[PDB]
Design a protein around this ligand. Structure first.
Ligand SMILES: Cc1cc2nc3c(=O)[nH]c(=O)nc-3n(C[C@H](O)[C@H](O)[C@H](O)COP(=O)(O)OP(=O)(O)OC[C@H]3O[C@@H](n4cnc5c(N)ncnc54)[C@H](O)[C@@H]3O)c2cc1C
Ligand SMILES: O=c1c2cc(O)c(O)cc2oc2cc(O)c([C@@H]3O[C@H](CO)[C@@H](O)[C@H](O)[C@H]3O)c(O)c12
Length: 457
């Protein structure tokens, strides 16, 4: 089923792995690419957002088919065990998506820009890569210029936030990846990847091990889930863009076990709240700051949550990074895919509860600016509800034992092996990470595309 050897073997089919296929299909057109996705194809084109399916029954079929083989939202599935431990909080609602397109087939396409300490300091071309990620995701800030209540909510929030703030951190329209239709991985891959005769997407293909020959990346061990047969595809470069959890799992199962692998895991603590407008008859952005480490997004709700005039407020906190926030794998216990079972060690420090308390007070302050608060008390979601897990394969300047990959997202111990996703982000971020993670993927894919085009082999 699979080719015996390719140039680049891509694990996963989310937006970050698709960004590797995108830049390689743009900058390295002669390189043969093999993308292996454990989940099935649930949309047309492969990786499109499920909302492109107008039929709710067909759309529910696409969502439920992505939930793998305390409830998870449509298109995602939770862990069955190893999500909490005595003495720690863990992530009881740590969810995952197994389908072509990954979570980008079910996400809401909010692509804000990092600011302050969120921005990775040792990347001088960060803004350059962030604009490129805007190009691949189709990000636009003017998707709701004709909305009646978008401008009203935005100006009423600005009356309490924009005080003393520079324009980059004032209330502004949330940059959205819209293609009406939310942009999925089909947008990231685009015509350049689908029309690339050297690229091929293999769905229902589980990658069980990363092959290493003489220290460098050798290939991937791919199990054909249609038949159960395990193949071995050779590759000069291996990109693992599974997710924030299964990416360190695949490396752990491959014997690639650095000290920082999975450690420094950080979830974005999320607070929700609702409020009502005041007039009779889009998504707003409350940017992060260092002194207010919260990321706010306000948007219209179809109806009131409690028994477009009603808005839903969501604040996301930046985590106090801890090394003991490790992702642990057990070789003896296997999950439903035959890979090592996950042990999630997550505990909010006192600094976390201090910031979380401030987020509840600030979202109430924001709810009073929009109008009459529909709710009475802001609700804190369980850890892992934001689906924004970082640091598990984080980048660093050196291999001091605190990072897993280079600034080019290249794993230190395994040359030719690259990791993609939110886990690559090493900083304490609060905004939606997918845009930044795609920007890091463009730098890593350009590191491969330049090494291929410049090589003599
Ligand atoms: C309801 C919802 C709303 C969201 N809204 C937002 C938002 O507004 N903003 C934002 O920034 N983010 C949002 N997200 C999160 C966003 O979708 C993800 O952060 C994004 O998909 C990350 O990209 P990725 O490719 O690294 O991860 P993924 O898309 O999860 O990539 C992992 C892929 O690899 C596959 N895979 C895993 N293991 C293997 C293996 N062993 N072999 C082969 N393939 C494998 C998986 O099946 C999956 O397709 C939302 C998520 C959900 C569920
Ligand atoms: O699922 C939907 C959704 C489904 C519909 O049918 C529809 O019409 C509109 C919808 O809008 C949404 C808007 C959202 O903000 C969220 C999100 O909460 C998550 C954790 O809980 C965070 O990851 C995301 O950062 C945050 O963006 C959503 O999950 C959804």
């Amino acid at each position: 089923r699979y080719p015996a050897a390719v140039d680049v073997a891509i694990v996963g089919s989310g937006p970050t792995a698709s960004a590797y296929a995108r830049i390689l299909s743009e900058e390295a057109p002669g390189a043969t690419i093999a993308m292996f996705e454990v989940g099935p194809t649930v949309s047309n084109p492969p990786g499109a957002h499920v909302k492109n399916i107008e039929d709710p029954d067909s759309r529910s079929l696409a969502q439920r088919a992505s939930e793998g083989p305390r409830r998870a939202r449509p298109g995602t599935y939770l862990l069955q065990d190893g999500y909490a431990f005595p003495g720690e909080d863990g992530m009881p609602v740590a969810a995952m998506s197994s389908n072509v397109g990954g979570m980008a087939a079910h996400w809401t396409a909010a692509c804000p820009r990092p600011g302050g300490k969120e921005r990775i300091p040792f990347l001088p071309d960060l803004e350059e890569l962030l604009n490129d990620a805007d190009r691949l995701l189709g990000v636009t800030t003017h998707a709701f210029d004709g909305a009646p209540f978008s401008d009203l909510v935005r100006e009423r929030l600005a009356a309490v936030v924009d005080q003393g703030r520079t324009p980059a951190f004032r209330v502004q329209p949330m940059p959205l990846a819209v293609h009406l239709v939310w942009s999925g991985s089909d947008v990231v891959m685009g015509e350049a990847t689908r029309d690339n005769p050297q690229f091929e997407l293999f769905d229902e293909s589980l990658v069980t091990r990363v092959l290493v020959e003489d220290g460098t990346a050798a290939g991937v061990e791919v199990q054909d889930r249609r038949s159960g047969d395990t193949y071995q595809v050779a590759a000069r470069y291996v990109v693992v863009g599974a997710d924030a959890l299964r990416t360190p799992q695949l490396l752990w199962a491959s014997g690639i076990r650095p000290d920082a692998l999975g450690r420094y895991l950080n979830d974005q603590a999320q607070v929700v709240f609702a409020s009502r407008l005041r007039d009779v008859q889009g998504v707003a952005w409350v940017p992060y700051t260092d002194e207010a480490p919260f990321h706010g997004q306000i948007m219209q709700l179809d109806a009131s949550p409690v028994p477009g005039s009603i808005v839903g407020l969501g604040l996301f906190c930046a985590k106090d990074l801890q090394r003991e926030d490790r992702v642990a794998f057990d070789d003896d216990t296997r999950d439903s895919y035959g890979l090592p079972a996950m042990r999630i060690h997550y505990r909010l420090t006192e600094r976390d509860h201090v910031v979380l308390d401030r987020a509840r007070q600030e979202i109430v302050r924001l709810g009073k600016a929009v109008g009459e608060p529909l709710d009475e008390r802001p609700f804190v979601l369980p850890p892992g509800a934001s689906l924004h897990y970082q640091g598990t394969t984080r980048m660093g300047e050196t291999d001091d034992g605190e990072s897993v990959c280079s600034p080019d997202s290249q794993v230190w111990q395994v040359p030719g092996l690259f990791v993609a996703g939110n886990g690559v982000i090493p900083t304490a971020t609060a905004c939606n990470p997918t845009l930044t993670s795609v920007a890091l993927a463009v730098r890593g894919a350009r590191k491969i595309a330049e090494e291929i085009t410049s090589s003599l082999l």
